[PDB]
């Protein structure tokens, strides 16, 4: 059935944002691995598979609404070289990602398309989950120090 | 059956006490887990159940002598803002609380109210108990620092 | 994650509710069993329960938004006395706290804190179909009789 | 081991009420239950029972003790006449005996008998217990009507 | 259903030569144990209950028919002062209540009161079953050795 | 937990006193078995294992006193050479622990020190049903003479 | 069967020596749990149950030989203050012990007892497995560092 067309391009929007946090938490759970932390990398692995299940359900949306999902384009991806970095990357994204999210939400509403808004409803407790989530690491790093940090998320032979 | 209008008190004033002891051990439960110390925050929370069976056994007993349990009102709550401060707030607690149920318990006794006393012979021991561990983790804290503690104390992703 | 600082004395004054409710169904809990009514007794004990839950969520939240919990307090208690007045007596609680959830709710939806909204919201309901199941033993109690309502609820002597 | 004279008869007063105890809750039980009121008539039998078993250990403590324990006489039972009078008239056996506990429980403390000295405040704490329990039953049975009180402690097609 | 008046007594005075066995037989079960004679002692126990268990059945009847019975003074009890006194002084006991059923399952037959008749009838067939027991205790003992016999009835981890 | 100096050194006296009745337990379960009683020296086995975890109990709480326990000395031993000998002797070392207890439970109840008053009065129960024990044994030995004591006890050839 | 008079004698120091070996770790157990070490605590006690049952055996073979076991005096104990000074108390005991077994071992032959001799090489055996142990703890420590040490051997809430 058809949609309003903003609606559409907000679901579009979004898409390429879980999309762009898909690629994001997946490269850094290969990084976080390799550098010996396998147990925030299994972390950040089902972060990435959570986002995931994201984008699937977006995509599911946006073509019930008679739209056309662009999945062609990702928007700019950060890279952490450092545990703590990897940490930041993720919560400046889940943060942008956010700030969009209700913007979008506060759309659905308006245009009284509101299942559309109550999936920004879930997104956006997933995402404050997330950033609640990164928040304690980032606390609990400072405060016991990196690489404390690191060991506590690393695993021996 | 009627009991002692002084054992009553001083079974409110226990009450007061444990209902003190719920929350500031709950409180400390979440802060602890958010600051990434989700091992003692586990703890934490055991220790405010306990505390919770314990009200509920004031409450059983006042009831019995014809007594009005006031749970209306708290005694001054302790908040650590870092783990030492949480292990500290919960020590000088338990100081204070037991102090208190030997006092109520030499009193029951003198009017022979001895059931009343082994309830609070039954409080003292678990307070010396929870007394314990908490001495421990100090000495463990300030023996391996305050950092490793923490480590010791979270867990990863 | 820096909180509005009126969405955290919102959720502050839900906490001191639900804490609060936990103590007054916890205490008729307590005095419906001395009294004999073991089963209305046995399903205050779970009410207080409820509300154990939610005083929880209130501090979860409350942390995360970067605010400060304040356990220190709670409000005016009702305990009655007749079992009529317990139940008279939770309504009342739960009438209040529904219209300060109500209040808490559009003062979020307000400043775009969504998920606030929706524990308020999820609150709300919560407080309602405890209203409904209240309301409905005292609608019980009009018919079948003051006293036959008591037995009923009554444990025998096992 | 030879046993200061005084706690081996405090051991046996107790003795006493408690087969006094025994004999009349059990016909209470055959009463209550030829009257039809099946399941406080099994209350009733539970706690015969229990009683057994403090009588049972009093006998023990004074054979340790090296004391000559007395079944031979017991006090006066008082035996209901109604279901309101069996409580009322198990009440007071109760408060004897808890009553009699004490006294003990602290002579033993003065001759340093302090295992005697604690099966009585063991003793205290099982007749405390059924206190509440008959109290309790008695607030119920005031407040729900003594003839529906009746009615919930009986059975049908049991 | 209101029985014969004298058959609402020999009921009574079956009552009280049971409960006095009951009392009996376990201060031996607490006395032979005391002593070393676990096994016995054991014995003495299950005894006990088995005349718990007459008590009860007389209490039944009694009530039924219309008769108030009464637990409150028992016979005077035999102790024994040695392993070899206690099976006598159960014997004797015995030998009493065989005797006084077999009065009262007569005057049954007189007033037409056949199931109290067989009461008594089946009465008489348990105090046989624990004559022929003890009296076959004594033979035992008799012939291998009172002091050997003791130690059969012992224990020695247990 | 800065405990009574004076608490501490009873219950290093208690320790003193536990370690003590391990080894000397444990040295009449080796003789007894070699001796042939197999039974009562498997008895012996754990009633010295008892005493292990008193001996624990005491250096867990006196630690946890702030005190420093002392492990480095024990009482003198009575080891016996008969079977008879071995049970007056553990006796004597029980009735002696005994009047230790009773008299530190006592120093405790006045400086207010409740738990360790609980433990001594927790540790008197344990020592007087050991001597309930031996007392029975010394008991049926007069009864059955020395000897078939010493078979009923011993083990066959397997 | 009458035995050597000296093997006896030989067998009751040796019974005087694991008699003290197992009030020193039993005592060591206690210390180092409350400490907050419960780990290595974990195994002192275990260390101590097995000195337990090498007195059981030397008690019996004592009465074998139709001597009488000395169990009323043990040897001077060691007791460390800090989790170091534990594992050195062990060291030096172990040590002793050992000296001792091997010269009560090469006597045991001469008089030509040799299931006694072979009793000492169980017991050789044992220790010096615990020898063993110990040294790995002492080189693990001292290499690590002495918190990282007590972390690694604790436990958390
Ligand atoms: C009068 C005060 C309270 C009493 C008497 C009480 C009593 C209890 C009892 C007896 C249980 C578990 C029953 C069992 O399994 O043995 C329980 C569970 C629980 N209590 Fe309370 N409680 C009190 C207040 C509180 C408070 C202030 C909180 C925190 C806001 C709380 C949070 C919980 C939670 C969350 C559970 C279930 C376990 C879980 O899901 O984590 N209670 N309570
Ligand atoms: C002399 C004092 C008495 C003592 C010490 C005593 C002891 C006991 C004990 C120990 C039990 C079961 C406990 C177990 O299972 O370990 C029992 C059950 C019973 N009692 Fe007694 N009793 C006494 C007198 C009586 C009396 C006066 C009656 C009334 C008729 C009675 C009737 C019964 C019956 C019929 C049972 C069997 C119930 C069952 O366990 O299924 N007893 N008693
Ligand atoms: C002659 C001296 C001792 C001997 C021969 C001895 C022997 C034994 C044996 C053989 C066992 C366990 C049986 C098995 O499962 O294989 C045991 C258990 C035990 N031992 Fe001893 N022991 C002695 C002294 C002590 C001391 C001084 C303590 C500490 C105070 C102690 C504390 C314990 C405890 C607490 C257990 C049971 C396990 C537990 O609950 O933690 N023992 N002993
Ligand atoms: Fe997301
Ligand atoms: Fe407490
Ligand atoms: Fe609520
Ligand atoms: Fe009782
Ligand atoms: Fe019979
Ligand atoms: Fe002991
Ligand atoms: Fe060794």
Known sequence: ????????????????????????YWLHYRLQEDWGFGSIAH???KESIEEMHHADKLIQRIIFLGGH???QRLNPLRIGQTLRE??????????????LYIEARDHCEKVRDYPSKMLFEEL??????????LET??????????????????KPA
């Open 1 to 24: 059935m058809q949609g309003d067309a903003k609606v559409i391009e907000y679901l579009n929007a979004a898409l390429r944002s879980e999309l762009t946090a898909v690629s994001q």
């Open 124 to 133: 956006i407790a997933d995402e404050e989950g997330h950033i609640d989530y």
């Open 69 to 71: 999902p662009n999945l």
């Open 137 to 154: 690491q980032i606390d609990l790093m400072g405060s016991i120090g990196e690489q404390n940090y690191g060991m506590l998320n690393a």
């Open 86 to 99: 990897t940490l930041d990357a993720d919560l400046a994204a889940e943060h942008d990602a956010r700030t």
């Open 43 to 45: 972390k950040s692995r």
